[PDB]
Amino acid sequence: NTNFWMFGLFFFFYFFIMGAYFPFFPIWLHDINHISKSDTWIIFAAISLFSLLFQPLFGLLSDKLGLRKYLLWIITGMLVMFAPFFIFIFGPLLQYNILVGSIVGGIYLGFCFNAGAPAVEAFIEKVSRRSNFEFGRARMFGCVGWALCASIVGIMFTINNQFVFWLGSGCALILAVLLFFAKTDAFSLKLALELFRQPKLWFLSLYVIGVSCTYDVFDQQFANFFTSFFATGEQGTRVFWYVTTMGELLNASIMFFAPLIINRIGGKNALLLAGTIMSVRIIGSSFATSALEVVILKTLHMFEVPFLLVGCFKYITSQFEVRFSATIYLVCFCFFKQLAMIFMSVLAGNMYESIGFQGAYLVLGLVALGFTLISVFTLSGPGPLSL
């Protein structure tokens, strides 16, 4: 099948390049640019700021272009500067001169990754229902492409921490290739505003601010709470990646059947089910008395991504007009998720020193669980009452 294999490999090489960036970036500020941990807490503070004006902006374009590949050409274009840009540019620019200067160059990302990954999901999702395949399939490539790269940052990470990057930049042109050969064949922004008054959006978004925002904040300190469960910080962390590397293959496998499970259960129960494993993981983390537990727990993450990613599209397409699938994705499951993730992540911090972890997480469960349970009724569609 023409589109399936091209855009399936597209996810493979796209998320491979998140590979270099995702778990490696903090290291490359940490070690290779000797920047201080007191400076990297601002860099992230900017990479998100820009994204806040790229994510909605990418949503309207990703619909107005429809199946036109122009917006995905820009991304594949910017991704090619992976290699010259950190080596050539993002490297010298904040060291000799005030970081505040190079911090802007950080916008690179905001564009490519934080606000560009979901634009790749959404676009390939639209193609996913003009060809004959399921979005969960092919998207499953993302996990294995992230797993493949995930194993390589650490291994050559101590022999040539410039190839990981260089390797990523190379895959960007492979990404240009697959974008070209693949062959694939509305609204106005004032009709787009109509959705923001429609009360069916405020319920879906509510679910995101409630369940998904709470989940993506939690999974923020988790690591710091997992390392404490092994002897030495290095032995503890070492085990972590292994969980991440190994559990993503399950996730990819889980995603493989995901769309079959998703297609009948229906969209709403897909999100409710996703909300449940996120809720259980939030409250479960509080009751921790052993690692073999904090491992399991990290694995559930792979049990909640399949449904969520696949499920949200089934929801958005099923209950909303498809003339807005990219927009209400990049505004609800991305924009509104990140906008609220500024604020909790504050709150969580205060809770720790106020109620440590145990006491904090416990709260997340009720909040995450409460909202999950509430969205059996705020979300329109068929609840779990049907089966």
Next chain:
Amino acid sequence: MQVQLVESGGRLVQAGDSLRLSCAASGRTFTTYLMGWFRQAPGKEREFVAAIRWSGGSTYYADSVKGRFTISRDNAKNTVYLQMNSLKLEDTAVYYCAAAARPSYSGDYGYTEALRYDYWGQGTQVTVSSHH
């Protein structure tokens, strides 16, 4: 945050004898998620001794002290113990309790890493005789 830990115990003891250290915690009762004993002499550094986690009571001890020491707790009255048997001569050094509670940035620390805990107690020296 200010919770605080108070050690008791320690005294002179003869090679082969016993001691019981206790560590009270004034504030605590939600935060600290894990308690440990660490010791320090001269010559060398802070050394991990034993760790335990309130909820559940799972214990860990750095090899050099297994079977010889027992770390226990008793929430019920904000106190963690170290039962030290078969003492030796090397076993002389200031013993500290420490408790965890909040997180803290870097490449993360584990259950033997001193830098890992968010709080400490003052001290109570322990001297095991070469003699007497």
